[PDB]
Scaffold this motif. Structure first.
Motif, short mmCIF file in Angstrom:
data_model
loop_
_atom_site.label_atom_id
_atom_site.label_comp_id
_atom_site.label_asym_id
_atom_site.label_seq_id
_atom_site.Cartn_x
_atom_site.Cartn_y
_atom_site.Cartn_z
N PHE A 38 0.82 -1.22 0.00
CA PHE A 38 0.00 0.00 0.00
C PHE A 38 0.85 1.27 0.00
O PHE A 38 0.55 2.19 -0.76
CB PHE A 38 -1.02 -0.02 1.14
CG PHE A 38 -2.10 -1.05 0.94
CD1 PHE A 38 -1.85 -2.40 1.20
CD2 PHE A 38 -3.34 -0.68 0.47
CE1 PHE A 38 -2.85 -3.36 0.99
CE2 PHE A 38 -4.35 -1.62 0.28
CZ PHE A 38 -4.11 -2.97 0.54
N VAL A 41 2.09 1.55 -3.57
CA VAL A 41 1.08 2.04 -4.50
C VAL A 41 0.83 3.55 -4.27
O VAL A 41 0.70 4.30 -5.23
CB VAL A 41 -0.23 1.19 -4.45
CG1 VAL A 41 -1.34 1.84 -5.28
CG2 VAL A 41 0.04 -0.25 -4.93
N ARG A 79 -5.88 2.76 2.38
CA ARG A 79 -5.91 1.41 1.83
C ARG A 79 -6.87 1.35 0.66
O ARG A 79 -6.57 0.80 -0.41
CB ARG A 79 -6.35 0.39 2.92
CG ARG A 79 -5.29 0.03 3.96
CD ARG A 79 -5.64 -1.20 4.77
NE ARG A 79 -4.59 -1.48 5.77
CZ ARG A 79 -4.71 -1.23 7.08
NH1 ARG A 79 -5.86 -0.75 7.57
NH2 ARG A 79 -3.70 -1.48 7.90
N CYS A 82 -5.70 2.97 -2.52
CA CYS A 82 -4.85 2.09 -3.34
C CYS A 82 -5.68 1.09 -4.14
O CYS A 82 -5.42 0.83 -5.32
CB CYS A 82 -3.85 1.34 -2.47
SG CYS A 82 -2.70 2.46 -1.62
N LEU A 83 -6.65 0.49 -3.47
CA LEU A 83 -7.46 -0.55 -4.09
C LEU A 83 -8.29 0.05 -5.23
O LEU A 83 -8.35 -0.54 -6.33
CB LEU A 83 -8.35 -1.25 -3.05
CG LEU A 83 -9.05 -2.56 -3.40
CD1 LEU A 83 -8.04 -3.61 -3.87
CD2 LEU A 83 -9.87 -3.09 -2.16
N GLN A 86 -6.31 0.88 -8.43
CA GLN A 86 -6.08 -0.32 -9.24
C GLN A 86 -7.37 -0.84 -9.91
O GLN A 86 -7.35 -1.22 -11.08
CB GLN A 86 -5.36 -1.41 -8.44
CG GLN A 86 -3.97 -0.98 -7.91
CD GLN A 86 -2.96 -0.68 -9.02
OE1 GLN A 86 -3.18 -1.01 -10.19
NE2 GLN A 86 -1.83 -0.06 -8.64
N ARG B 79 -5.59 -8.51 2.62
CA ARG B 79 -5.64 -7.19 1.97
C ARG B 79 -4.74 -7.14 0.72
O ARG B 79 -5.12 -6.60 -0.33
CB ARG B 79 -5.18 -6.08 2.91
CG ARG B 79 -6.11 -5.79 4.05
CD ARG B 79 -5.74 -4.46 4.70
NE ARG B 79 -6.63 -4.19 5.82
CZ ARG B 79 -6.34 -4.40 7.10
NH1 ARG B 79 -5.13 -4.83 7.50
NH2 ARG B 79 -7.26 -4.12 8.01
N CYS B 82 -6.14 -8.85 -2.31
CA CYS B 82 -7.09 -8.03 -3.05
C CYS B 82 -6.37 -7.01 -3.90
O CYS B 82 -6.75 -6.80 -5.05
CB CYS B 82 -8.07 -7.32 -2.12
SG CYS B 82 -9.13 -8.40 -1.14
N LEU B 83 -5.35 -6.37 -3.34
CA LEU B 83 -4.61 -5.35 -4.08
C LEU B 83 -3.87 -5.95 -5.29
O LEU B 83 -3.95 -5.42 -6.39
CB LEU B 83 -3.67 -4.57 -3.14
CG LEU B 83 -2.89 -3.40 -3.73
CD1 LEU B 83 -3.83 -2.35 -4.30
CD2 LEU B 83 -2.01 -2.78 -2.65
N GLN B 86 -6.13 -6.83 -8.25
CA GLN B 86 -6.44 -5.64 -9.04
C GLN B 86 -5.21 -5.15 -9.82
O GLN B 86 -5.35 -4.81 -11.00
CB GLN B 86 -7.05 -4.53 -8.18
CG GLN B 86 -8.40 -4.87 -7.52
CD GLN B 86 -9.52 -5.17 -8.49
OE1 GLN B 86 -9.48 -4.79 -9.65
NE2 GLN B 86 -10.57 -5.82 -7.99
#
Lengths: 125, 125
Positions: A38, A41, A79, A82-83, A86, B79, B82-83, B86
């Motif tokens: 994270f 990213v 968090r 970041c997700l 993407q 977590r 998931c990142l 993506q």
């Protein structure tokens, strides 16, 4: 024991260790503990628009306070930044290319028609 | 104050609220605490391969123990699953189509030549 296991289990181990960094948010010392990937990213996002990661985060804090009145669950919010970054790249809403600054995009075009769990329909001031 | 603020600040508020679920990890009921968007993404990953989310997580736990000897930082690991899912969709390595099983893929092709923060080079057993 299958491709799914192989892809997910073989994360770099350090990428999901948690690292604490200090930031001054609205002038006050604050703790942000994030998984390393994270931080990575967020650093990419910042670089894309020629900012240091700390400045990106301070600016996000400032704007989140204005949008919501306070910046609750701020680490969780980073968090999800970041997700979502993407997800948006995976959907081709944000170009998956470092040379295009996010600030050059049309945010209403980037967000339009997204599922409701992926954005808040209320525009920024 | 710009398109970057607009895109990032306007997350769905609930998407970054943390919600606990109970998971059976090597026989032990354990509370896993994840932001809502991570649960949403884990549910999509499980659905791609016709799995119930609880079975996906239990299988991940099992395989992580086998690979590393233990499953330390398991919530952080989820977590990062998931990142990375993506990231890999953004990179075009996993098709951004939620009907194509991950188990359909060639994991070696998926991981080949990635940035070092995105994978471990040691193959699963």
């Amino acid at each position: 024991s299958n491709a799914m296991c192989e892809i997910f289990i073989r994360a770099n181990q350090r990428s999901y260790s948690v690292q604490a960094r200090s930031l001054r948010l609205h002038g006050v010392a604050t703790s942000v503990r994030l998984e390393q990937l994270f931080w990575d990213v967020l650093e990419e996002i910042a670089a894309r628009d020629g900012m240091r990661v700390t400045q990106l985060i301070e600016r996000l804090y400032d704007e989140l306070v204005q949008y919501r009145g306070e910046a609750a669950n701020f680490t969780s919010f980073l968090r999800v930044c970041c997700l979502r970054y993407q997800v948006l790249q995976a959907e081709g809403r944000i170009p998956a290319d470092a040379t295009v600054p996010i600030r050059s995009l049309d945010a209403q075009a980037v967000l339009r028609g997204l599922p409701a769990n992926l954005y808040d329909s209320r525009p920024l001031g």
